[PDB]
Design a protein around this ligand. Structure first.
Ligand code: HEM
Ligand SMILES: Nc1ccnc(N)n1
Length: 289
C-alpha cells in the first residue's frame, strides 16, 4: 500500500506560508481558549494523533489520508478534546479550501510548535484525502497507564527508536491533561515550547496519587504532572540517559524534536524524487506580522 505525495495543483511555498500565517494569526487572536493556554498545544496533539494511527507493517493509518475528518476517527475515545482543534482549523480550511485535510492538520502542528517558540519543523505538502473506508479503526493510539516497556514496544509500530520517543514526549511540557477527556487532570498552562518536561521530571518531587477519575498519576506541589508513561522515562535506564541529555541541552532537544516530529508527520508517505524540498516557514515574528 503506497501513498504518493501529490502537490496541490499549482501551489508553492508561498501558498503554504499564507496558510501558516492564517493559523498563526488565529492562534494569536483566539487567546482565551482553555483558560488562556490558547490552541497551540491542542493543535500539536491533533497533528500527532492523526499521524500516530500509522502502522509500518501495512501502511495503514498515518497523516496522508486526512481520515480524522470521518466520524469513526473523530469519535475515537483516544481523540476526545481534539474536536476543539478541528473547529479552530475550520475557518482556515474555508479560506484555503484547496489544501488537503492531512496537509492542514499536520501544518497546524508545525505552525503551533513554531509560534510557541519551538524549533523550525520542515514540512512537505502533498497528502491526498482518501475515502471513508480507509479510516483506521480506534485503538491505535497509546494508553497512558502503562510502563516503559509498553511505550518502547508501542513506538516500534511507528518506527521510532528510544531517542525519537524521548524527544517526541518533550511535547508534554505543553498544555494540560483534562479529566473529562482522558481521565487525567492537570499540568499547568504552559504554551511556550521548551525542554522543561525533562527538567521537571528530574528536579521535581513527585508523588504517585489518585485523581478524581480513580487513575494514578504523578503530581508535584509546584503544579506539574506526569502520566505514568511520562514517568516511565525516568524509571527505565536507557530513557533516563536521554532525559538527562535533553535536560542539559536545549539546542539538542530542539534539533532532535524537529527531526522526529517531521518524521512522525511524514510516516507512510512516498515523496517522488522531483517533489519540492521541505518548506521551512517563517514565523509571524520573523515576518514582522
Ligand atoms: C506514550 C505516548 C503518549 C501518551 C500515552 C499520551 C497521552 C496523553 C494524554 C492522556 C493527554 C491528555 C489529553 C487530555 O486530557 O486533553 C495528552 C496531552 C497532550 N499530548 Fe500526549 N501522549 C503521548 C505522546 C504524545 C506525543 C508523541 C505528542 C506530540 C509530539 C503529544 C502531545 C501532547 C500535547 C501537546 C498534549 C496537550 C494537549 C492539550 O493541552 O489540550 N503526546 N497526551
Ligand atoms: N504530563 C503532561 C502531558 C501534557 N501536558 C502536560 N502539561 N503534562
Amino acid at each position: 500500500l503506497v501513498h504518493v505525495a501529490s502537490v496541490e495543483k499549482g501551489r508553492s511555498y508561498e501558498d503554504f506560508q499564507k496558510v501558516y500565517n492564517a493559523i498563526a494569526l488565529k492562534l494569536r487572536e483566539d487567546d482565551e481558549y482553555d483558560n488562556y493556554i490558547g490552541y497551540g498545544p491542542v493543535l500539536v496533539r491533533l497533528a500527532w494523533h492523526i499521524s500516530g494511527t500509522w502502522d509500518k507493517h501495512d501502511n495503514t493509518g498515518g497523516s496522508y489520508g486526512g481520515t480524522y475528518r470521518f466520524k469513526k476517527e473523530f469519535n475515537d475515545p483516544s481523540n476526545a478534546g481534539l474536536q476543539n482543534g478541528f473547529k479552530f482549523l475550520e475557518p482556515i480550511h474555508k479560506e484555503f479550501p484547496w489544501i488537503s485535510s492531512g496537509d492542514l492538520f499536520s501544518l497546524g502542528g508545525v505552525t503551533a510548535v513554531q509560534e510557541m517558540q519551538g524549533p523550525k519543523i520542515p514540512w512537505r505538502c502533498g497528502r491526498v484525502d482518501t475515502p471513508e473506508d480507509t479510516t483506521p479503526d480506534n485503538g491505535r493510539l497509546p494508553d497512558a497507564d502503562k510502563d516503559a516497556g509498553y511505550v518502547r514496544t508501542f513506538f516500534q509500530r511507528l518506527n521510532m527508536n528510544d531517542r525519537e520517543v524521548v524527544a517526541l514526549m518533550g511535547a508534554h511540557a505543553l498544555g494540560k491533561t483534562h479529566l473529562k477527556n482522558s481521565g487525567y487532570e492537570g499540568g499547568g498552562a504552559n504554551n511556550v515550547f521548551t525542554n522543561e518536561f525533562y527538567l521537571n521530571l528530574l528536579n521535581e518531587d513527585w508523588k504517585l496519587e489518585k485523581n478524581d477519575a480513580n487513575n494514578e498519576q504523578w503530581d508535584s506541589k509546584s503544579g506539574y504532572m506526569m502520566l505514568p508513561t511520562d514517568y516511565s522515562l525516568i524509571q527505565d535506564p536507557k530513557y533516563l540517559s536521554i532525559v538527562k541529555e535533553y535536560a542539559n541541552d536545549q539546542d539538542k532537544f530542539f534539533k532532535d524534536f524537529s527531526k522526529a516530529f517531521e518524521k512522525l508527520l511524514e510516516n507512510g508517505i512516498t515523496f517522488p524524487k522531483d517533489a519540492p524540498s521541505p518548506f521551512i516557514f517563517k514565523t509571524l515574528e520573523e515576518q514582522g506580522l
